Design a protein around this nucleic acid. Structure first.
Ligand SMILES: C=CC[C@@H]1/C=C/C(=O)NC/C=C/C(C)=C/[C@@H](O)C[C@@H](F)Cc2nc(co2)C(=O)N2CCC[C@@H]2C(=O)O[C@@H]1C(C)C
Lengths: 206, 142, 7
RNA sequence: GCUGAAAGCAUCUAAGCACGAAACUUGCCCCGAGAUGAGUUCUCCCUGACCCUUUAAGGGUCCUGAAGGAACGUUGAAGAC
RNA sequence: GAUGUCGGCUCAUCACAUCCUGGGGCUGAAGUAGGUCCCAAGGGUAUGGCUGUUCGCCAUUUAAAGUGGUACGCGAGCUGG
RNA sequence: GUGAAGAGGGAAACAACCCAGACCGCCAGCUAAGGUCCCAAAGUCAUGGUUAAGUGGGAAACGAUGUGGGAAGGCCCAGAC
RNA sequence: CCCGGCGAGGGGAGUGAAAAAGAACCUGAAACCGUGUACGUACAAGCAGUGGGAGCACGCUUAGGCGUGUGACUGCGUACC
């Protein structure tokens, strides 16, 4: 079904009763609110529009003010969309909590990766470094050949921006769901740095 | 005096509607290009668009001979090393039947800013409905 | 002259 | 392979019909409306006075200057610029 | 009135006459394990000792350690035995 | 014989092949090779046949109840195959 | 006389037939670099032209529909020695 939007608060260690340490990626999934409910008669696909968080009064734009005021829902920090699986129904102004993930046992998180900036072939494509001595001339961490005896094929692995892109990790085990704190304990690591917004949706890969 | 030459600023262009169901691919599109190019008009001019807009319906019901419905391949490239992807006549109708006529015309028309402008006067629809009646279209038994 | 350019 | 004639029988085939692999099309992930065929939904803002003129998708003046954007600044787990 | 040559390093890429994995037919296929032929190029496809070597032999592995084209791929990318 | 020293039209493009020998000019026409659905000027032209493989539009020995046509022959209301 | 750093370099005045002669000085070409105006130009592929040719601008024109410049689109077209 649908997912939710939260914040990467960080990572901590969870000790069970048998003395095992389960890595977790805590997420502050604030109470979400629906903004739009779209159908096929107008748009052409069953989905919803959800926001979260808050924003300053004298900083948000007027166009969005009416977009949020239309549904009588306080402004958020962004907007996202979730497709419905032919069996989901919602209404504007409806608030969604973290309990939605109570009986799922697995999710696929999504978020933006960290920013490495301009990266090299080694940092980026795990290229094999050349000889550091024994003759090498200014060609230690260089790629080498990029073709044959007359064009560089498209998709050629080269240096460039590394990170700051959409990334989706799949099949992450859930550990705990504390609605009192609006938290979600996801096992393992997830993209993005502390404070970045990320999506959490049930796992399709089982 | 200098031979007549048409001017696109004051030349007439009419609208027509067609149903290709049961029609053969080449023997049909051959007449399309002939019309979007203007070779059926007395004011024909190679460097001008003296054609007539056309709206063909039921593109998913064309007719073909032999096993072309299965053997006819539609190759194309993406600009990569693998690149080449093939699709049989059936795989196109089920996924995108409009491109069949859109492609047959592309090979019958001139290659240039003009031949591409003729295409723009071509409108295809897989079904029998359309929202172009406001243009007062006409019938064509081709 | 000496081998490859210009050893 | 079933059925089954041509060819009284037989036959997986010619008409029809059912199985069939990490290939191909899908489904998983990312880019993605410069898709010039340039798409779709919601919301927000502007409701002046005239002149002249090849009298038109015309030009110019006075008043008006929103929504929003940009610039500037403090900066970033963003970044060569 | 100049197209710089083996091999190594690096980065690869396509073909299929398939090394492995996958799907099958006959088998002098009991089984296990093989042989032969067909379909299949999706991905994957050793490290070291001697030698400048490719190759090759040897040791030990691996499901397998494929055959070839690309100026016997690649020196305005390195090396220079 | 052409090219070299020869343009032009055709063969998709292609000095040597096919047609044909450019004094200059015209928005005149008839022809050659070669062609006449579209890109692309001209027959979706007429008659009677063949092919089902896109053969046409790359290829041998050799194999094959493919298929049309042609002349016989053997056995057939003593019942044949 | 004025700007300017009691500058360089300029602007007026003035001399002179000439200052469009400022001594970087008769005449003052081209390559090359610029300002202004008209037209074209951000879905369009290749010796950048040629033939045809829309539209725009200006000058004619006793509106005569011509000429000048621009050249969307279109056929053919791979520099010279
Ligand atoms: C004592 C010096 C050895 C001597 C070199 C002579 C010489 O004059 N070399 C200069 C290189 C010229 C080049 C690289 C010219 C390129 O524009 C074309 C070449 F690539 C073509 C090509 N060359 C080769 C094969 O094919 C070829 O054999 N050589 C090229 C590198 C040297 C080698 C050669 O000629 O060596 C001689 C040996 C044999 C006595």
């Amino acid at each position: 079904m649908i997912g939710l939007v939260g914040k990467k608060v960080g990572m901590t260690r969870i000790f069970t009763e048998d003395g095992v340490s389960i890595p977790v990626t805590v997420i502050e999934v604030e109470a979400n609110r629906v903004t739009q409910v779209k159908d096929l008669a107008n748009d052409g696909y069953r989905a919803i529009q959800v926001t979260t968080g808050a924003k300053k009064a004298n900083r948000v734009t007027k166009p969005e003010a009416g977009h949020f005021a239309k549904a009588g829902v306080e402004a958020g920090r962004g907007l996202w969309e979730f497709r419905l699986a032919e069996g989901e129904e919602f209404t504007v102004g409806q608030s969604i909590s973290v309990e939605l993930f109570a009986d799922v046992k697995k999710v696929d998180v999504t978020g933006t990766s960290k920013g490495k900036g301009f990266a090299g072939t080694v940092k980026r494509w795990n290229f094999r470094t050349q000889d550091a001595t024994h003759g090498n001339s200014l060609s230690h961490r260089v790629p080498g050949s990029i073709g044959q005896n007359g064009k560089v094929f498209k998709g050629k692995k080269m240096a460039g921006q590394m990170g700051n892109e959409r990334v989706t990790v799949q099949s992450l085990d859930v550990v705990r769901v504390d609605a009192e704190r609006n938290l979600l304990l996801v096992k393992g690591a997830v993209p993005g740095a502390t404070g970045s917004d990320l999506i959490v949706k049930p796992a399709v890969k089982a | 005096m200098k031979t007549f030459t048409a001017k696109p600023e004051t030349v007439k262009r009419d609208w027509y509607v067609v149903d290709a169901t049961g029609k053969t691919l080449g023997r049909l599109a051959t007449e399309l290009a002939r019309r979007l190019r203007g070779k059926h008009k007395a004011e024909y001019t190679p460097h001008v668009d003296t054609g007539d807009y056309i709206i063909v319906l039921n593109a998913d019901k064309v007719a073909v001979t032999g096993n072309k419905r299965t053997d006819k391949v539609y190759y194309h490239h993406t600009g990569h090393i693998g690149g080449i992807k093939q699709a049989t006549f059936e795989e196109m109708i089920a996924r995108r039947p409009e491109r069949v006529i859109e492609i047959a015309v592309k090979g019958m028309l001139p290659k240039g800013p003009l031949g591409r402008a003729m295409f723009r006067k071509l409108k295809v629809y897989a079904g029998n409905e359309h929202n172009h009646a406001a243009q007062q279209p006409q019938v064509l038994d081709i | 002259x000496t081998x490859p350019f210009x050893x």
